[PDB]
Amino acid sequence: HKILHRLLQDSS
Amino acid sequence: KHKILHRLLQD
Amino acid sequence: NSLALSLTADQIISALLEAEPPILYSEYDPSRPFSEAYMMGLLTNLADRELVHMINWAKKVPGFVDLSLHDQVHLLESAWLEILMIGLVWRSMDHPGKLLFAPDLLLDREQGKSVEGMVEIFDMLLATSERFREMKLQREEFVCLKAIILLNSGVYTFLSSTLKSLENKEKIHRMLDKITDALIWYMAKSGLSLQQQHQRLAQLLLILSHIRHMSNKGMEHLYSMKSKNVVPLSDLLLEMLDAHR
Amino acid sequence: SLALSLTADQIISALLEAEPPILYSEYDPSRPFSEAYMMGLLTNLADRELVHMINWAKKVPGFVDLSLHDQVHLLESAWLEILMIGLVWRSMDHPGKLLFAPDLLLDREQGKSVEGMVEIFDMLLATSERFREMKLQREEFVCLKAIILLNSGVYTFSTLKSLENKEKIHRMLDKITDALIWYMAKSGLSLQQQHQRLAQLLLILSHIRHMSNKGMEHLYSMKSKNVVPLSDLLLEMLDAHR
Ligand SMILES: C[C@]12CC[C@@H]3c4ccc(O)cc4CC[C@H]3[C@@H]1CC[C@@H]2O
Ligand SMILES: C[C@]12CC[C@@H]3c4ccc(O)cc4CC[C@H]3[C@@H]1CC[C@@H]2O
Ligand SMILES: [Cl-]
Ligand code: NA
C-alpha cells in the first residue's frame, strides 16, 4: 500500500 | 503593443 | 474615486448581466469520425471565437477600461481559460453528466475519452457543474464570479513600482471589494441570514481555486496538443497560450 | 459528529494547538548551492515536514472521521499548497526573502541556482508581501491552511459513501468560515469589512493553488532530469498529480 496511507494509520 | 490582444482591446 | 468605483451593488450586477456574451455554436457534425483531432478542432475553434466576445465583455466590466491597455492585456492573458471554463460549467448546470460546450455540442465523459488526457479534465469540470447545481447557483452570482476571476487572477503579478501603477493596483483591489459587496447584497436580498451569506460567499470563492486548478491543467494540455501538432491553433490562441510560457 | 458541534472559539483553539513545528534544513554552509544541492535541501525539508503535516491533519477537527481513502486524497491534493502557505507565513517578517527554515533564508538570487525556480520564488515573495499588506493574523492563517486541506481535493471527480464523506467536508468548511468571521468580528472589524476581508483571504487561495501547480510541474521536471532523488513518499505525493 502507499506510504501516505500507512502513515495516516499511526496515532496522533 | 504588437500583440493581437493589444490590438483587439483598442476596438 | 471614479464613476465605476461609485456604482451601487444593483448597478454592478445589472451592468454585468447586460454584458453577458452570446452563446456560440460549434461545427459539430455527427457524420464525422469523432477522432482526437476532430474533437480538439471543435473545441479550439470554439474557444478562439469565444475569445473575441470575451474581450468585448471585459471592456463592459466596471472599471476595466479605466486600466491601462497593458494592464487589460495582462488580466485577460491570465484569466482567459478560467473564464471559458466557468462559462462552460455554468452552461452545463442543467445537463447532469454532460458539458455543454455549445448548444450543438453536449459531451459526456466517455466522449471526453476521445482525446488523450481530456477525461481527467472533463471529470473536474463535471464535478464543478455538479457543485453549482448543488448550490443552486444564480446568474447574478455567476457574473460576479466571472468579474472576480478577470480582476483577481493576474493581480499578484501586477507591478506597483511607480505611483501610477500603484494607483492602478489599488483600483483593482477596490473594485474586487465592490464585487464582493454586490454578491453579498444579492444574497441578502435573496433572504439569506448573515451566517448563510458568509458561508455562501466562501463556498463560491473556493470554487475559484478549483477553476484556477482546472485552467492550469487545461493550459498544460493545450500546450501538449500544440506541441504534438494534433490540431492547428489560431494566432490569437497561440499568443494567449504563450503568455503562460 | 463531535467535530461539527465545536464552537468557533474551539475550532480556532484546536487549530492553533495543532500547529506543526518549524524544522531546520540540512544545509551545510561549507558547501555552495548547486542546482542539485539546493533541490536536495528543499526536498529533504519537504519530506520531513510532510510527516508533521500528516500529524497536523489528524488534528484538524473531523479529518479523522473521514475514510482513509478520503484523507489520502485530500492530502495528496493539498500538500504542496500547505507547504507553500506555511513558507509564506514564516517569511512575513523577512521582506525579500523566503524562510524555508531558520537556517535556510533565501533571496531570489539564490533561487536562481535551480533552473525554473526563480519564477516560483517571485510568486511566493509576492504572496508574502500580500500577507504583510493584509496584516494576516495567525488565527486567519490556520483557518486558511485547514480550508486548503479540506477544499483542494473535494471536486476531483456516485457511490453513497462518496456523498456521505463529501457532506461532512462541506459542513466543516462552513464551520471554518464561521470561525474566520467570528475572529474578525471579535477583532473589531465592521460587518462590511468582515465580508470584504473574507473574500480577500479566500482569493489568496487561488494564487496558492496556482503556485502549487507550477511547483508541481517544476518538481516533476527536476525528477525527470535526474536532478535530485526523491523519497518514496514524495514520489507518491508527486505521482498523485500525474
Ligand atoms: C483548452 C482545451 C480546449 C478548449 C476547451 C474549451 C473550449 C471552449 C470553452 O467554452 C471552454 C473550454 C474549456 C475546456 C478547454 C480544453 C481543456 C484542455 C483543452 O486543450
Ligand atoms: C517543489 C519545490 C521543492 C520544495 C519546495 C518547498 C520545500 C519546503 C517548504 O516548506 C516549502 C516549499 C515550497 C517550494 C517548493 C519548491 C517549488 C518547486 C520545487 O520543485
Ligand atoms: Cl460565431
Ligand atoms: Na462570432
CATH number, domain of D150, equals 1.10.565.10
Q: CB distance C124–D157 less than 8 Å?
A: yes
Number of domains in chain D: 1
For residue D3, give the nearest of D217, D171, D194, D224 by alpha carbon.
D171
Q: CB distance B4–C236 less than 8 Å?
A: yes
**Phi and psi of D201, rounded to 5°?**
-65, -45
Interface of C with D in 167-186 (CB under 8 A): 173, 176-177, 180-181, 184
Calpha distance D49→D87 (Å, rounded): 11
Three-class SS of residue D104? Answer: strand
Calpha distance C71→D87 (Å, rounded): 29
> Around Cβ D157, how many Cβ atoms within 10 Å?
14
Contacts of A12 in chain D (CB under 8 A): 55, 58-59
State which residue of chain C sits closest to D198, comparing Cα positions.
C202
Q: DSSP 3-state helix, strand, coil percentages of chain C (rounded to 5)?
A: 70, 5, 25
DSSP D31: S
Calpha distance C186→C145 (Å, rounded): 13
Residue D44, C-alpha cell as written in the block: 529533504
Calpha distance A2→A7 (Å, rounded): 9
Calpha distance D110→C137 (Å, rounded): 46
Contacts of A5 in chain D (CB under 8 A): 68, 72
Calpha distance D70→D74 (Å, rounded): 6
Chain C interface residues facing chain B, Cβ-Cβ under 8 Å? 52, 55, 58-59, 69, 72-73, 76-77, 235-236, 239-240
Residue D115, C-alpha cell as written in the block: 533552473
| Chain A nearest CA to D91, separation (Å) | 28
* D26 among annotated binding-site residues: no
Residue C99 in contact with residue C122, Cβ under 8 Å?
yes
Calpha distance B8→C30 (Å, rounded): 34
Distances from the Cα of D203 to the Cα of A1, A6, C146, C177, angstroms = 36, 34, 13, 11
Domain enclosing residue C19, as ranges: 3-243
Judging by DSSP bridges, how do beta strands C98-102 and C105-108 pair with one another? antiparallel
Question: Quick check: A4 contacting D, CB < 8 Å?
Answer: yes
Residue D176, C-alpha cell as written in the block: 471554518
For residue D91, give the nearest of D79, D81, D104, D78 by alpha carbon.
D104
Three-class SS of residue D56? Answer: helix
User: How far does the centroid of ligand 2 lie from the alpha carbon of residue D84, in Å?
Assistant: 7
Calpha distance D40→D231 (Å, rounded): 10
State which residue of chain B sits closest to C71, comparing Cα positions.
B6
- Calculate ∠ Cα D65-D67-D72, nearest 5°: 110
| Identity of the residue in D157, D180, D194 whose CB atom sits nearest the CB atom of C127 | D157
* C221 among annotated binding-site residues: yes
| Solving technique | X-ray
Calpha distance D235→D219 (Å, rounded): 10
Q: Maximum Cα–Cα distance for chain D, whole Å? A: 57
For residue D139, give the nearest of D92, D190, D89, D173 by alpha carbon.
D89
Residues in chain D: 242
Residue C225 in contact with residue C117, Cβ under 8 Å?
no
State which residue of chain C sits closest to B11, comparing Cα positions.
C56
Residues in chain A: 12
Measured in Å, how far apart are chain B's first and last C-alpha atoms?
14
Helix or strand run (H / E) with residue D107:
strand D104-107
Q: Is C63 left (phi over 0), alpha (psi -120 to 50) or beta?
A: left
Calpha distance D194→D187 (Å, rounded): 10
User: How far does the centroid of ligand 2 lie from the alpha carbon of residue D157, in Å?
Assistant: 27
Q: Give the type of residue at D223.
A: K
Give the residue, out of C36, C43, C82, with the most ligand 1 atoms within 8 A of its beta carbon, to mutate for a pocket test: C43
* D49 among annotated binding-site residues: yes
Three-class SS of residue C172? Answer: helix
Distances from the Cα of C237 to the Cα of C57, C92, D119, angstroms = 17, 23, 23
- The number of the ligand 1 atom at minimal distance from the alpha carbon of C118 is 18
The resolution, in angstroms to one decimal, equals 1.5
Q: Give the type of residue at B3.
A: K
Contacts of C240 in chain B (CB under 8 A): 5
Q: DSSP 3-state helix, strand, coil percentages of chain D (rounded to 5)?
A: 70, 5, 25
Measured by CA distance, the residue closest to atom 15 of ligand 2 is: D215
| Identity of the residue in A3, A8, A12 whose CB atom sits nearest the CB atom of D68 | A8
Task: Ligand 2: list residues with CB < 6 Å.
Answer: D 42-43, 45-46, 49, 83-84, 86-87, 100, 120, 215, 218-219, 222
Chain C: partners with 3+ C-beta pairs within 8 Å: B, D
CB-defined contacts A:D, below 8 A: 27
Calpha distance C216→D78 (Å, rounded): 15
Touch criterion met for C and D (3+ Cβ pairs within 8 Å): yes
